[PDB]
Design an enzyme around this catalytic site. Structure first.
Site, PDB file in Angstrom:
ATOM      1  N   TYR C  70       0.836  -1.193   0.000  1.00  0.00           N
ATOM      2  CA  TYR C  70       0.000   0.000   0.000  1.00  0.00           C
ATOM      3  C   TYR C  70       0.875   1.249   0.000  1.00  0.00           C
ATOM      4  O   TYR C  70       0.530   2.260  -0.608  1.00  0.00           O
ATOM      5  CB  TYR C  70      -0.907   0.014   1.237  1.00  0.00           C
ATOM      6  CG  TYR C  70      -1.817   1.213   1.305  1.00  0.00           C
ATOM      7  CD1 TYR C  70      -2.979   1.266   0.540  1.00  0.00           C
ATOM      8  CD2 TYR C  70      -1.494   2.302   2.108  1.00  0.00           C
ATOM      9  CE1 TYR C  70      -3.807   2.393   0.573  1.00  0.00           C
ATOM     10  CE2 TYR C  70      -2.314   3.433   2.148  1.00  0.00           C
ATOM     11  CZ  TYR C  70      -3.472   3.478   1.379  1.00  0.00           C
ATOM     12  OH  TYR C  70      -4.104   4.705   0.612  1.00  0.00           O
ATOM     13  N   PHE C 132      -7.223  20.057 -24.448  1.00  0.00           N
ATOM     14  CA  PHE C 132      -7.845  18.806 -24.854  1.00  0.00           C
ATOM     15  C   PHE C 132      -9.237  18.923 -24.245  1.00  0.00           C
ATOM     16  O   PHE C 132      -9.379  19.398 -23.117  1.00  0.00           O
ATOM     17  CB  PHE C 132      -7.105  17.601 -24.264  1.00  0.00           C
ATOM     18  CG  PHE C 132      -6.191  16.911 -25.242  1.00  0.00           C
ATOM     19  CD1 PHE C 132      -4.992  17.496 -25.634  1.00  0.00           C
ATOM     20  CD2 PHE C 132      -6.541  15.676 -25.783  1.00  0.00           C
ATOM     21  CE1 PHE C 132      -4.154  16.859 -26.550  1.00  0.00           C
ATOM     22  CE2 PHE C 132      -5.711  15.034 -26.698  1.00  0.00           C
ATOM     23  CZ  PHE C 132      -4.515  15.628 -27.083  1.00  0.00           C
ATOM     24  N   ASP C 133     -10.257  18.515 -24.993  1.00  0.00           N
ATOM     25  CA  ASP C 133     -11.638  18.605 -24.522  1.00  0.00           C
ATOM     26  C   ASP C 133     -11.810  18.321 -23.033  1.00  0.00           C
ATOM     27  O   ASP C 133     -12.418  19.113 -22.313  1.00  0.00           O
ATOM     28  CB  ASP C 133     -12.535  17.668 -25.335  1.00  0.00           C
ATOM     29  CG  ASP C 133     -12.639  18.083 -26.791  1.00  0.00           C
ATOM     30  OD1 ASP C 133     -12.924  19.272 -27.047  1.00  0.00           O
ATOM     31  OD2 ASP C 133     -12.440  17.223 -27.676  1.00  0.00           O
ATOM     32  N   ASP C 223       0.855  19.050 -20.605  1.00  0.00           N
ATOM     33  CA  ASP C 223      -0.065  17.955 -20.920  1.00  0.00           C
ATOM     34  C   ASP C 223       0.741  17.131 -21.916  1.00  0.00           C
ATOM     35  O   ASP C 223       0.829  17.486 -23.088  1.00  0.00           O
ATOM     36  CB  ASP C 223      -1.319  18.501 -21.598  1.00  0.00           C
ATOM     37  CG  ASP C 223      -2.366  17.432 -21.845  1.00  0.00           C
ATOM     38  OD1 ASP C 223      -2.004  16.317 -22.277  1.00  0.00           O
ATOM     39  OD2 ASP C 223      -3.560  17.714 -21.619  1.00  0.00           O
ATOM     40  N   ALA C 225       0.689  13.550 -23.226  1.00  0.00           N
ATOM     41  CA  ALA C 225       0.366  12.194 -23.648  1.00  0.00           C
ATOM     42  C   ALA C 225       1.284  11.817 -24.813  1.00  0.00           C
ATOM     43  O   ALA C 225       1.608  10.644 -25.015  1.00  0.00           O
ATOM     44  CB  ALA C 225      -1.093  12.108 -24.075  1.00  0.00           C
ATOM     45  N   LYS C 266      -0.715   6.631 -24.499  1.00  0.00           N
ATOM     46  CA  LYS C 266      -0.308   7.022 -25.837  1.00  0.00           C
ATOM     47  C   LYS C 266       1.172   6.683 -26.002  1.00  0.00           C
ATOM     48  O   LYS C 266       1.541   5.508 -26.046  1.00  0.00           O
ATOM     49  CB  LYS C 266      -0.541   8.523 -26.056  1.00  0.00           C
ATOM     50  CG  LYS C 266      -2.006   8.951 -26.029  1.00  0.00           C
ATOM     51  CD  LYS C 266      -2.793   8.314 -27.166  1.00  0.00           C
ATOM     52  CE  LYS C 266      -4.252   8.773 -27.182  1.00  0.00           C
ATOM     53  NZ  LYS C 266      -4.383  10.219 -27.510  1.00  0.00           N
ATOM     54  N   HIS C 459     -24.309   8.220 -29.651  1.00  0.00           N
ATOM     55  CA  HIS C 459     -23.387   7.574 -30.579  1.00  0.00           C
ATOM     56  C   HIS C 459     -22.908   6.193 -30.133  1.00  0.00           C
ATOM     57  O   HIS C 459     -22.610   5.341 -30.963  1.00  0.00           O
ATOM     58  CB  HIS C 459     -22.180   8.479 -30.853  1.00  0.00           C
ATOM     59  CG  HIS C 459     -21.418   8.870 -29.626  1.00  0.00           C
ATOM     60  ND1 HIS C 459     -21.956   9.665 -28.637  1.00  0.00           N
ATOM     61  CD2 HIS C 459     -20.154   8.586 -29.235  1.00  0.00           C
ATOM     62  CE1 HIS C 459     -21.054   9.856 -27.689  1.00  0.00           C
ATOM     63  NE2 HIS C 459     -19.952   9.211 -28.029  1.00  0.00           N
TER      64      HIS C 459
END
Ligand SMILES: [Cl-]
Ligand SMILES: [Cl-]
Ligand SMILES: [Mg+2]
Ligand SMILES: [Mg+2]
Ligand SMILES: [Mg+2]
Ligand SMILES: [Mg+2]
Lengths: 467, 467, 467, 467
Positions: C70, C132-133, C223, C225, C266, C459
């Site tokens: 842990y 990014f969204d 950010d 990725a 990614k 969708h």
């Protein structure tokens, strides 16, 4: 005292708990022969510790980093590097057939002394503190007689000696002298020794033995399936090395051999593989001949080899096998079982680091040798506790290939071995409790007689019934 | 009696044996706080059993058969199929944030009853035989009050009852009545129950509870991190199911809930993952809303998910977790530790299948509560045996966020948990021996005082020194 | 030119070749929605490259070396060490919820400037070369407005620029000035940038941007990725770093941010996990608050975390992801697909390192926007070649939650992404051939209309039929 | 046409891209002998396809489900079950030494006919459509002469025949007649056949051959390292089986042999292991003798064996190896390479499913045979493209062990083999481009001469320099 595990269990193989009724049926289906039982029906399998032990996380992970190239493999390089750093040996030849490293070096060393020192094949004699049956096997074939030069205390269960696996130094010197140095193809140093259930060899003794071999320019081969356990016994019992690490003791130990031959299925912690290694250039030609002979071993080009992952795993296993806490724990567990059995009155003909040989004859005195009391004991242990052990007596011995009559056997023993990092103190107590139960019900156990008997290697597939 | 392992150890994680001097230095370096110790320096880590247990061979192998497709993954299908066959539930939603299945279904169920039965948020009340802190946490937020309706025998350590985790049936009926059925968003059935260190809930009790919920059309959520152990206790203690398999008991058990929420890091044997599942179409809209809400949980599209191998592993783990021999063994070991500690005079405030809560206050009476006697006990256990346990007392409780003063605590406890299939009977005896030693040297153990204290969650990184 | 793979394929996941008739039936069963297709029925899955790529041998092997403690886990240490050596950042916080690192640092940075520089929440504005969204999502919530300050060439498909992901330096300076430095909680540097299908950001630009942020003491979050691909574009296009290794470029790059937030799914080559890291002590309090907030993120104690093996794998993946030959190969393949489609007359609205957005509207001019020409194109590509792509148009956009009417969409695009080290040049040619076929039969492709439509996130599970 | 991969790449082994200068140095360091190059320095290793191919996810996963029991292993059972279901053979003997299944059955079958049909060892003759060197090797030893009865079209590169591996039926009948049925120990059916680079054998032909053997009661051994590819060629070219699955063709195929011997390192997709299996009871005694002889193969008890995981993997590999899409893809790639080389003017002496044998003599006409033009070509291919191929000419042939003079060789060939599911169409084009380059610069390539030459197996470790 059983030491606590110096590790956390990470992966387990489920084993079902069976009912007595179920086992009674299973043993009958198997023709009163544990060798014929399904692994799944065996709760505690003490058949052998060869390749049946657990592996560490890093060892398992290594299997996925393999370089499968036919030559120049980085996985082969990693394995060779481990051998160099651990044993100080420059040449490494991976073997896969198992303990199959002897079928190679034996013929090579014979031819070597024969061409350099006019060795006489009809008078060749090889020595060892104690040859492993297979080693002795490949040696006898090729026309080489073997001689075990072990000490007087070796098989004396009545006397406690720190290194019962030691070479009989005077005996060795005398043997070479007798046979003639030109006729001694090699000396095999087995560590730990297979004599008396597994006994250690001291570094002092190995040095002395090597000096003798060196004086007569005789190649020394270190048979080291249990190199780590021997190193542990040295650290524990040989005063001079008390503060040395297992690794330091191992490096020093191998200065006293010219090459090593070993099954990696014991101390090295892997399920398969072996090694044939040479210390330095002085043995480069022996390395070449062995490597070469390994390819044309059949008299022509044949190709095989361990997969890359297997070499990567062994490269790690050679190190994990030397962990001090692990070794102390492994050996303490074995000793815990022996002491426990002795306490309940179970008598062993010999008991060491390799195995315990219970005297079934004494435990089941009412059963005639020809009725296989040790095979009867094996079946009873399975019925009672689901334990599988191997008989080492008349059943195994077999018949005379010329008279078809049963061969005489000195004792009816039941061998108990312990897979590394596989079972716990609770299983050990379970085994002890099982024997306590058998000893209590000894008088009722029945002898056995064949219902089906193969002409050769009968112990593996023969079926029997109770008398 | 500690049962023998119904399995063979196959993979181990080496743990070094340390010296007392080394540990003395380590604990000081860690500021007398085991939470700050390196895992490598902990011989027996009893911090938590959540995701720290071993896995079976098949579970481990499954990790390499993953289908990483964003949708229509065969690995997701295998996991859903396991849920269908084991619990009989048609809808499966894998969760990864851990026990993160509650932050989803709670808001969904509240809104459901609010739009269908004019639920009044200002008067909403959720019930459970015993809410897990986190469950109670996500519930209180959203404006929902929780109420534990456990039986009188639940926390009575003086009386032995077969199912201390049982719902207080009359209490539940009375509660719904009082609060009003329209204001009860859901009922959570925790199995086994977290009350009193972990206590089982009988199938008779679950049936009765479900009938009550069904009568008032109230959704029932089965919090089942330990569904298998509860099924084992039922087989062991509820006469009617004595001959039923764990699987049959589990299938029957889930007929008495509308959906299930569970961390897979306990009985399911995996290091990560969780589940949120719905039984049938009657709860399809709840499934949709949960699945949908799982994506826009942040108020907009966010993407995550367990890797294919993790779903394949859990699909196998759900089954391996139900192995009868395994469960008997797991529970017997826990009980073995408790019984052993009781024998040596160690007093526990509560002890169950989940954990044992040793009363450090009584063991170290000379240390004031403000000096954290349970944190002092944790440090002593580490010094003496390299064991790591968590304090559940004043240290953990912390200070009042409005007065900055220490919060009052009813008892100073030291929690002991046991990772599944990780440690042996020998480690259990080692723990017991450790406590025997501490109890013998109790008078010399010193209290603690801060040298560094965080403003929040101080137990994780605070440093202290001896008084 | 498509470069040859700088690797040997070692493990494969079999995918069945289907017949056209079979696919015709499958797509109908799926309601003309690839999202509803079984992964097994998709030959080439271009849905997403997030967590769907291959791993190296060492990365896979690492999964078996996990320390599940842990706290104080050696696996967590290995991961932190990799971050320190690669990015030079001293503090590491592993995230598992995926890109879930933003939901943590955003609220923390807002409160920070609010208590230190009297930040006014009602006037707060965050900047980025392109949010990014999700990033923009977590930012808007909490009451923070976002602004993308990208350069003029960014979306100009008619002009070729080496670093279209670059910050609009003057725009940023002007924005902070306008909004007021006290109201700018943070600046997010996205690399590579998500604008125009994925475009790189130069090191010169990052330095300039950081100097601006540093002047106004504004926290900079990288950010990353796709940190490795950005480093590759810099090595390829920024003259000054032509001879620098990817590792050197990465170390230099991160000197221009105060912390990093990234999905490891990614460039880091893993199927799950993320990171939130801080460069040095100057941001220790931000680290504390983030770590702390990560536990009580729900307003109370909640526990989760990546399994030990996952941290060990990411610790290796961060390095393997920077392999120069790999990066050159990965990017060349993407470019190979784009160039191939352009050659056959397929028009893309935007195409970059992240994805290619084919203009279905222009490819299927006869189909009205409301009839989802990009969803029709996705179904046709599947029918013809078993390829699965995602529509980014009217279908995805959905309806106005207040009028229930279809929302207007600027273009009907079909997104193509490429899982790393998963498909070959042959699959790329297969995709190109597929489009050639669709373009040839464009006039016959039919529009779609709902048969089942969810109220939200339609969708994912909506079903449609041909018009 | 190169077919697209019927699979997703899941695990890769990174291979560095080297510079020409680096390779120039490497080849010199290796003494102009690719066998001496490190695997890491070889970009495309075409040395051999034996055990160097990729595995599927399920095959890899199986390695972690091993039962290491010495006997009754469930892993051995799974492997035997696969053989029973795939080939319809009741008896299975796993071999590990590799193609080491022949050294066992040969001596057994000889003794069998010798004791039952008074076989005359001095006149024994074994037949095969084409004996693999090793097979022929173990046969010649033991005193058995071999004869290849292949058809006229077999080696005719000028004529295209669907089954060039076919037995010369009349030739076989004539041979047995000549030699005498009592002196024919066995007939070996090799599929696919090793003649002419690998050519298929039709089922019609196998039936006819078996009828002949059956008429004379002669044991038939199916040498099936490439059983799956042969089954694919039958499905593709033998009209009668056009609609049969690979599995159905395989089951039918094995009705025409009494037992099978095979290396699993080819079509079975594993890095190690082999099989020796018997169809039914009619050959139970042969099974016994083989199993028995496998233990005392050295004249005494020796123990070895594949680890449990290896048997589990092969049990899966036997099935994955039969995947129809995989086989079509594998074979198409091989054919793609051959066709590509033919197009650029590269001449091959023989080219089949196993390998392509480029005529280096014709490609480098200026280099004398004694100067090893094929070894020079191998070094040039490495220098230019980092490809490693094996010379099959004068270099390999060696010297006469009685005259020390170079042995005459009919042609100087360079062998190209292709590891399964390892390289892509791009690597194939890279190889073709490489040859195009060599052909263009042929006149400048230099011959070689020894600087170091071993007495035996010189091709493996000899060093040479340019003339
Ligand atoms: Cl590793
Ligand atoms: Cl599996
Ligand atoms: Mg190999
Ligand atoms: Mg995923
Ligand atoms: Mg964990
Ligand atoms: Mg084995």
């Amino acid at each position: 005292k059983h030491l606590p595990e110096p590790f956390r269990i990470r992966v387990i193989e489920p084993v079902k708990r069976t009912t007595r009724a179920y086992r009674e049926e299973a043993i009958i289906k198997s023709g009163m022969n544990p060798f014929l039982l399904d692994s799944e029906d065996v709760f505690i399998d003490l058949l052998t510790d060869s390749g049946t032990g657990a592996v560490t996380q890093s060892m398992q992970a290594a299997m996925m980093r393999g370089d499968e190239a036919y030559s120049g493999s980085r996985s082969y390089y990693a394995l060779a590097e481990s051998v160099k750093n651990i044993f100080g040996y420059q040449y490494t030849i991976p073997t896969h057939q198992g303990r199959g490293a002897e079928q190679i070096y034996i013929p090579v060393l014979i031819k070597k002394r024969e061409q350099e020192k006019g060795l006489d094949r009809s008078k060749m004699v090889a020595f060892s503190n104690y040859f492993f049956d297979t080693t002795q096997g490949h040696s006898q074939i090729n026309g080489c007689t073997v001689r075990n030069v072990y000490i007087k205390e070796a098989f004396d269960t009545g006397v406690r000696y720190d290194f019962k696996g030691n070479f009989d130094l005077e005996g060795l010197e005398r043997g070479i002298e007798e046979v003639g140095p030109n006729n001694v193809p090699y000396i095999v140093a087995t560590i730990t020794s297979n004599s008396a259930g597994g006994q250690p060899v001291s570094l002092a003794n190995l040095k002395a033995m090597y000096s003798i071999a060196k004086k007569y320019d005789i190649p020394v081969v270190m048979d080291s399936a249990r190199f780590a356990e021997n190193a542990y016994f040295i650290k524990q019992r040989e005063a001079e090395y008390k503060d040395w690490t297992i690794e330091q003791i191992t490096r020093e130990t191998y200065k006293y051999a010219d090459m090593l031959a070993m099954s990696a299925k014991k101390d090295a912690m892997v399920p398969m593989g072996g090694l044939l290694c040479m210390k330095d250039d002085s043995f480069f030609d022996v390395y070449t001949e062995c490597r070469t002979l390994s390819v044309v071993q059949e008299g022509f080009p044949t190709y095989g080899g361990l997969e890359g992952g297997a070499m990567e795993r062994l490269a790690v296993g050679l190190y994990d096998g030397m962990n001090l806490d692990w070794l102390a724990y492994r050996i303490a567990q074995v000793q815990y079982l022996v002491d426990g059995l002795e306490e309940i009155g179970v008598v062993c003909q010999q008991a060491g680091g390799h195995a315990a040989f219970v005297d079934a004859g004494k435990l089941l005195p009412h059963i005639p040798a020809d009725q296989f009391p040790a095979q009867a004991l094996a079946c009873e242990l399975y019925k009672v506790a689901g334990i599988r052990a191997v008989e080492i007596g008349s059943f195994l011995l077999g018949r005379d290939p010329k008279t078809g009559k049963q061969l005489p056997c000195p004792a009816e023993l039941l061998r108990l071995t312990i897979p590394r990092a596989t079972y716990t103190q609770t299983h050990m107590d379970f085994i002890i409790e099982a024997f306590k139960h058998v000893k209590e019900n000894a008088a009722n156990i029945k002898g056995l007689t064949f219902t089906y008997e193969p002409k050769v290697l009968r112990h593996f597939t023969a079926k029997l019934k109770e008398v």
